[PDB]
Design a protein around this nucleic acid. Structure first.
Lengths: 265, 404
DNA sequence: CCACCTGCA
């Protein structure tokens, strides 16, 4: 039953991988026939879908940023920028020379954006994470990517014992704190720069859109769960997840506690 | 090292999040005692409202005798400087960052804030209107200690102010500063990757990634398109940061091994060491048992990870008294620890244990030869760096605010 | 100086 719930959570995560899920909105779910249209204007199908996706993500983007995400499609950086001119002139999106950015036209629905915001990042597990015995797999039952963060794979010893020890700490949500944050953090967050602060305000609003829904779904079979842990190439250890994580933001840390409570004395 | 009750660690944690984390322990508990009956109204002015609130609710639950799952936080005061002070045996650097006790004229052990100490020393000597902001100085200090040259050139210029900054660092932490100097000259211009193994067997690989800039025209205006590519470089500025961060990585792994241990495993290793274990052996254990024991011999850092590989045959290659000594130095009851690289969280009734374990690890690094062991792998040949005060580790065992 | 994957007008 929790085993089933865990399989449900991983199924949601696998269905909401950011880039593959966005592509669907421009392929099998668009009224627009981008296949036909990209053929018409002579732009490679996979390139065009990818450019549309990147613009629906970024909303606004300078030229070096946009060619960077797409560079692997062409043998030359120049070919990428040309393709981007061809698409901006055919109204796939706009380029405004006075601000030197591309501006999106076609964006994904709010309903799909809400699913991506809920499930594109790893969640805690509601069963004990799989014991790691090789440098592939991060604790879930359906992922087998390299355990090391970014493109830094080795099959040498990276102290799996540490990950296995952290992964089995049972955790839970303190709903008393979680409700205090939702009710009171926005009027408690006093200006801590002035562009960095207005940035931390947005980061909370995005979080507040989906955290309680995720926390409620997460703990459907009980208020007890486990974070998966990954090393970077140096051997710093990172717990994985956005909505529930004792690393990261102060409004995030506060809500987590040990599932095995103790009488202090 | 003075100890505290579990309820007192709750008091310190709530004070920290108010927060008075740079105050001594007793000033923090005194502030708490004074405001105990009004805590919930203080939430709107605490530096960390949510964590303060979580702590206050835990304190109330403890008063009512209710069980709690809330973990308190103890932070390394300048992790990097602590590690570099220990590696180099730099007693002066140690006093900046609570690796050893600092006392004022009164003789009270003070909770030192390295960045403040160096900022004051710089105003004191720079004098006469010094145009420097306190927080920009901390940025310059901490990026410099990790090997940055770009950020001090930006906060202090390239003139007399920079000169005073480097002179100050060389009096306040001579060996730490000399070593940072040295790391710069340790790159190999032919290397695509650097590799070293930590004493608990973690393999560090740093791929050398260099900027490739393709220039592009879009509406006859030029745009530079920069992508990270694997390559080589004549100098390299990364070694101090990566080596130091690999060591705080190790301190995290080993602290968690020593705190959150399997009690049944511990008792097996104890029986194994005393010749009382039923015969059990796996040939696959030998390589790893030998490898980790060797790192102990070369470095002084014995990892509790070795318990995983000790059996009837493999115990024969180690000194059983060292294994028993390590186990005897661990907490009498195990506990969970959450870590944010150099922040540590546990139930408050283990506060004393977590600070004892952090102290032991710093003292081990101070006493031993981890730096030579790591530098030798980085540069490709045996080198030895010496301790500037080879007895520093003795004072490290008893230091007060390593975690604060 | 290092990292990490946050956010996407």
């Amino acid at each position: 039953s929790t085993i089933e719930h865990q399989m449900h959570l991983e199924k949601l995560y696998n269905k909401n991988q950011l880039l593959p899920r966005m592509r669907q909105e421009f392929e099998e779910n668009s009224g627009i026939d981008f296949k036909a249209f990209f053929a018409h204007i002579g732009i490679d199908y996979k390139f065009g879908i990818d450019a549309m996706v990147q613009m629906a993500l970024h909303k606004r983007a300078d030229l070096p940023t946009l060619v960077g995400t797409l560079r692997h499609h062409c043998k030359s950086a120049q070919e990428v920028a040309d393709n981007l001119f061809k698409m901006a002139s055919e109204d796939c999106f706009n380029f405004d020379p006075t601000i030197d950015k591309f501006i999106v036209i076609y964006t994904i629905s709010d309903d799909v954006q809400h699913e991506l915001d809920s499930f594109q990042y790893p969640l805690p597990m509601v069963v004990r994470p799989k014991l790691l015995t090789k440098n592939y797999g991060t604790g879930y039952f359906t992922c087998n990517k390299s355990v090391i963060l970014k493109k830094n794979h080795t099959d040498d010893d990276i102290c799996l014992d540490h990950l296995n020890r952290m992964n089995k700490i049972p955790l839970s949500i303190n709903w008393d704190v979680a409700h205090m944050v939702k009710n009171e953090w926005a009027n408690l967050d006093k200006p801590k720069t002035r562009q960095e602060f207005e940035k931390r305000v947005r980061a909370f609003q995005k979080y507040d859109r989906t955290a309680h829904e995720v926390m409620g779904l997460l703990t459907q079979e009980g208020n007890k769960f486990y974070l998966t842990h990954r090393p970077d190439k140096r051997g710093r250890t990172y717990s994985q997840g956005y909505h529930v994580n004792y690393q990261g933001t102060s409004w995030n840390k506060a809500v987590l506690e040990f599932a095995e409570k103790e009488v202090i004395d | 090292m003075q100890t505290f009750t579990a309820r007192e660690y709750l008091k310190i944690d709530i004070a920290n999040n108010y927060g008075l984390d740079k105050e001594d322990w007793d000033d923090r508990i005194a502030w708490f005692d004074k405001n105990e009956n009004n805590l919930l109204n203080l939430v709107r002015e605490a530096e960390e409202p949510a964590l303060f609130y979580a702590g206050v609710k835990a304190w109330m639950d403890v008063k009512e005798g209710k069980p709690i799952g809330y973990p308190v936080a103890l932070d390394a005061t300048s992790s990097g400087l602590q590690i570099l002070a220990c590696l180099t045996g730099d007693r002066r650097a140690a006093e900046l960052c609570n690796v050893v006790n600092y006392r004022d004229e009164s003789g009270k052990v003070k909770r030192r804030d390295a960045y403040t100490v160096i900022y004051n020393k710089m105003l004191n000597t720079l004098g006469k209107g010094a145009r420097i902001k306190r927080n920009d100085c901390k940025q310059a200090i901490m990026t410099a200690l990790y090997g940055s040259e770009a950020k001090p050139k930006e906060v202090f210029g390239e003139g007399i102010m920079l000169n005073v900054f480097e002179s100050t660092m060389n009096v306040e932490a001579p060996a730490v500063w000399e070593l940072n100097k040295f790391w710069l000259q340790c790159g190999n211009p032919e290397a695509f990757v650097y590799h070293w193994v930590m004493p608990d067997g973690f393999n560090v690989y740093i791929k050398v990634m260099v900027n490739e800039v393709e220039t592009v025209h879009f509406l006859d205006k030029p745009y530079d398109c920069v992508r990270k590519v694997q390559g080589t470089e004549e100098k390299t500025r990364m070694l101090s940061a990566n080596t130091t961060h690999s060591i705080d990585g190790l301190v995290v792994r080993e602290l968690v091994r020593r705190c959150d241990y399997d009690k049944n495993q511990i008792e097996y290793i104890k029986a194994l060491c005393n010749g009382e274990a039923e015969y059990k052996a796996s040939e696959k254990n030998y390589g790893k048992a030998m490898e980790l024991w060797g790192y102990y011999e070369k470095t002084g850092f014995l990892t509790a990870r070795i318990f995983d590989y000790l059996d009837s045959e493999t115990i024969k290659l180690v000194n059983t008294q060292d294994i028993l000594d390590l186990i005897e130095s661990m907490p009498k009851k195990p506990f969970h620890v959450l870590t944010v690289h150099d922040c540590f969280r546990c139930l408050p009734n283990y506060g004393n244990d977590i600070r004892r374990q952090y102290n032991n690890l710093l003292a081990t690094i101070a006493k031993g030869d981890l730096l030579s062991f790591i530098m030798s792998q980085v540069i490709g040949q045996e080198v030895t760096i010496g301790k500037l005060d080879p007895t520093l580790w003795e004072d490290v065992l008893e230091t007060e605010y390593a975690l604060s």
